Symmetry: D3
Subunit: 244 residues, 6 copies
């Protein structure tokens, strides 16, 4: 397969126009997209160690969920220099699907909704991010699923008691901003996401929203693993994971 | 028999308001007549709803907090903010905050951390005076043991590289672990002690080789806030209690 | 005469003056309040949520305070001085404060319609694109228009008589503050005479240059005319004691 | 006798342009050759169309106004501004303004008001130098009588509270009655004399207990402008007339 | 059979050919200087620029209505001194109307860009930019023939940035006026082999060389005046009015 | 045996980075390890693709340019910038720029022009230090002949007016012929020597009566850049070649 064909397949699953405004999705680093691809690597982050591992494992198409850069730059030194040097010197293509992969059908948020078997799931935000629906079971059962499948030691902000058959909101990645807490508190009893910080914990306690931080990494890697299986099943291509 | 304005004078002598960084909402949060006599002072990290309820329950007349009531301004009064204000106003509880001016001032929250680790030749970490950095005269393991004994029993350690003895330690009380902070501090220190670590910042520290120790936002401020509470208790003839620590 | 829940009063008011009619950025709706199941015995109406209005509301046992102007235009993050005094009174008495501002200016039979109907404007149209103000032909003389103004709105309006006004002229009306320099420039292309409130020096000079006759019947009176109509409307439909506080 | 540039130098010695507040469009409004000989100088508050027509009718060569011709810039020349510019350009009448620099300078428009009321220990009201404030050594009624005799016969008085003798009086020539000004001045004075009162500012003054006297924008400026005109007449051998006062 | 027209009739005619809503966002088109548009017009003058020398020549020649492609001012002002004072004074004391059709004249059918596309007989021309500016299509011939046309009809010594060899039947982009900004070079490199426009500067030359876009600078003036002459001929054919050109 | 950081130190001593105007992207463009030993330094006006290819071909390990690689920041790497970065990174070629700091410094690109024309009592043209202006002690024709001999054989001359002997000459290396520059310099000089003339600026200069001589952006910079190259060659024991001049 050619790089552009891999990109075509991925964009059919996760169309770029589903990405939220300003999200740096698509080609991160690359020039010739007609090149035949020897090995595909999948990672959450285009980190320096991921990129070093890509070169070591002979990966020539590196797919990541997070973009290489959010903020644009005009000097190339330090860590970004080391990263670009490896990608360019080895002609490794770097391509990202970020919020388009969060939002698309069977994408990262759908993977969470399906894991918890949410009843009548809907998008949490108007832009399509996150899912919300009824968890048909006890709070304890929800926690066991979280601990078994996502993360063993989640932070639980137990802001109030949770009855059976509650509204569960899920957001893969960083969903625990203060403004998100305020928003989700109007829509759900429990909010499962990642990257909890102090001010957001206090706000959830005030609003009575139960928050479960199963970490940014794990709430995304759960769906990313499913995405990797989908690619492996459909493409005649060697595919490896680099930071999971 | 102290007046609210005299408590405010005492606090602002320790932590002058002009030390606060641009835009920080410090000073009087809620209150009108500052000639009011104050019988009981409450100290808290956060002006949360539960802290404010506890203040009312305990007969607190002056509520001092590190964090301001609001960061972003509002023009409607409903829900939680309505509930908070209602309690403060019907009890005429004054709410007053010292935030980054208390981080930055001499013997404030960052100085308290610097003194705990006995930093050699300490300097402000940032140009605006936030944080401290200097040499820790000992091993990484000794630095960790101090952290576990006095700050947080189990901090997250991002061990991005090996750390030699007599290393450069930067400390910042509260939330110091933004991505831009990681990048900045990596140029100034081997080890960075602060709070509120998140994923992108963890990855960035590993790339840069900066060892990051997250002893939490709460604990890295409450360490110094307890010192500030003792300082107030020693100098003021006033009943003083802590509400969320 | 019975008691209503606050949410029922709000629902009625918003059917008359829908919130989506408000112009961009206008702070309309709930100003101060939490539980809208609160039972309401006495509804108070005011132009302004002033300190004296709020004191009178407390004094008169008002449970629901409706005002045309919002409590705050610019948001705040400290609560001291006057705003402290106002909120303390409202919160201690759990008085709900609710506002309908430009949505009440713009809606059918709202404040601007009330003026257009008073002057019996022929073929009235909205004055601005956002629906604010009204303009049409006044079927009469300038003096007849002034006497109507004097009888119903304000007895001694300031008249900037920029030119002679012939019978059957184009009259623009805007309830409240409609006399900014940019408004004078805009309305000068649309009307012979502009009736509104809050005239200041640079706007007077500008009107004289443009030949636009301006009548300042005051911000207060040009809104209160329609606010009285609104109060009568509520009194006719709601079984509630309803009082006016600053008019 | 005199060239325009000499008239300008004299005015700018009295009211230096660097006194004008940021963004104020002061100085040469319309003109090219400043060596032009000037026989007749006209002074006006506003560079209005009727003032400019009168300048042309009276053979004015140099038109001085307090207010600038334009606050906001334009890139098309039609309607009233076309009419104004055509009269000035076709007659090579120079139009020059001193606006807030004339408000702020020593013996300028605000100083003229301070001196009329014989304010004790006067200070600038704002940090940028606008307005004056000091003690009025007399009763409220005496202050009002001075106001009515020398400034405007029927000022609007917002009597927000009782005013005792020897009160703090703030004065600002022109438009000083914005909401943000009311809030500011309420901290500094018992009584505020200025112009261009509107509804929201009246309500706010009542809430704050600030007594406000609107003696109008026009009259509170023209008082000092008449003084300025006499000063010019005393010092320049030039025919000098006033156009809108 | 030469008569006087009212200014508003001239404006109506021009705006029928080049409607104001074709002008790009922010473009200062329409009436520049003037008040009464019932003014009777005996002599219409056409110019590229409302320069001081053009306005002086207009006054000298008794022009009553001055039409220019470029607006008098792009950026607004609030003081009237120096050159703009000199210009406005001449226009106002003589009550000469100044009116401009700028990008609406660039974009309209048979406007300045179409005139270039037609001169090069572009095959299947399309607007170069989405807002309608410029034209692009196939030049059915050799690069050398394209050059000969350029030299004969537009400008005798055009600057050629020969970034690569150009084969016959290439994609030719044209933009009348200043089309050679860096952002334009980048954009057009994706759409054409050759870019004919005006006002080349150093950074743009380097960028064109990097991208392999052949750029031909036939000057800002000449790439617009070619079409402006057509426009003047069009007016002369349709209005029974004396019409002269002032800076061409 | 000299290190990249030592080359950079030498250059920044001559042209300190703090002389660069606000926002100018000067300093290290591409590079990581500045302890690297440098065997061959290349000097160029532009970090163009052809310059960078030539640098690789000639074995240049330190590439110095006047113009920065990027003015506007990017967050994707494709096309031409990909090709350029790849060549630099795969060969570990350092790219370093001194832009307006080299324009402004003593004996920098603008001083070099001022010295060529032997300007009398030269001063900076702009407040930020850009450009130079002073008296040319000779005729306009003598000035043109110097230009033709040393800078550019055939400069564009916009002869807006006649020029008397001993006129005021302003020089600015590179692109100095913006419309706002034309307006500014017309107040300070009779003749303006710079580069990159476009139509609107030509018209404006004719209106103002400012004589403009466009000796091209490239040539007015390369003149001083050659001087800078000789200065480096005279002081550093290093192979130094020029790449686009
Ligand atoms: Fe993420
Ligand atoms: Fe904090
Ligand atoms: Fe109003
Ligand atoms: Fe004024
Ligand atoms: Fe043009
Ligand atoms: Fe340059």
């Amino acid at each position: 397969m050619k790089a552009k064909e891999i990109i075509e397949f991925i964009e059919t699953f996760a169309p770029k126009d589903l990405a939220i405004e300003g999200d740096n999705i698509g080609l991160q680093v690359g020039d010739n997209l007609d090149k035949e691809i020897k090995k595909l690597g999948i990672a959450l982050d285009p980190s320096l160690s991921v990129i070093k591992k890509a070169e070591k494992e002979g990966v020539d198409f590196l797919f990541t969920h997070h973009p290489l850069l959010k903020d644009p730059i005009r000097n190339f030194t330090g860590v970004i220099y080391k990263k670009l040097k490896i990608l360019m010197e080895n002609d490794i293509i770097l391509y990202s699907a970020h919020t388009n992969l969060d939002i698309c059908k069977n994408g990262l948020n759908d993977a969470l909704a399906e894991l918890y078997n949410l009843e009548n799931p809907k998008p949490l935000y108007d832009n399509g991010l996150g899912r919300v629906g009824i968890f048909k079971g006890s709070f304890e059962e929800f926690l066991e699923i979280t601990k078994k499948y996502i993360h063993k030691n989640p932070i639980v902000v137990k802001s109030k008691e949770v009855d059976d058959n509650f509204k569960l909101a899920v957001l893969s990645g960083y969903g625990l901003s203060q403004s998100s807490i305020k928003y989700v508190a109007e829509k759900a009893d429990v909010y499962l996401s990642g990257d909890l910080t102090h001010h957001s914990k206090i706000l959830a306690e005030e609003l009575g929203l139960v928050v479960v931080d199963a970490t940014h990494y794990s709430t995304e890697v759960f769906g990313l693993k499913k995405f990797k299986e989908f690619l492996s099943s459909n493409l005649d291509l060697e595919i490896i994971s680099l930071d999971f």
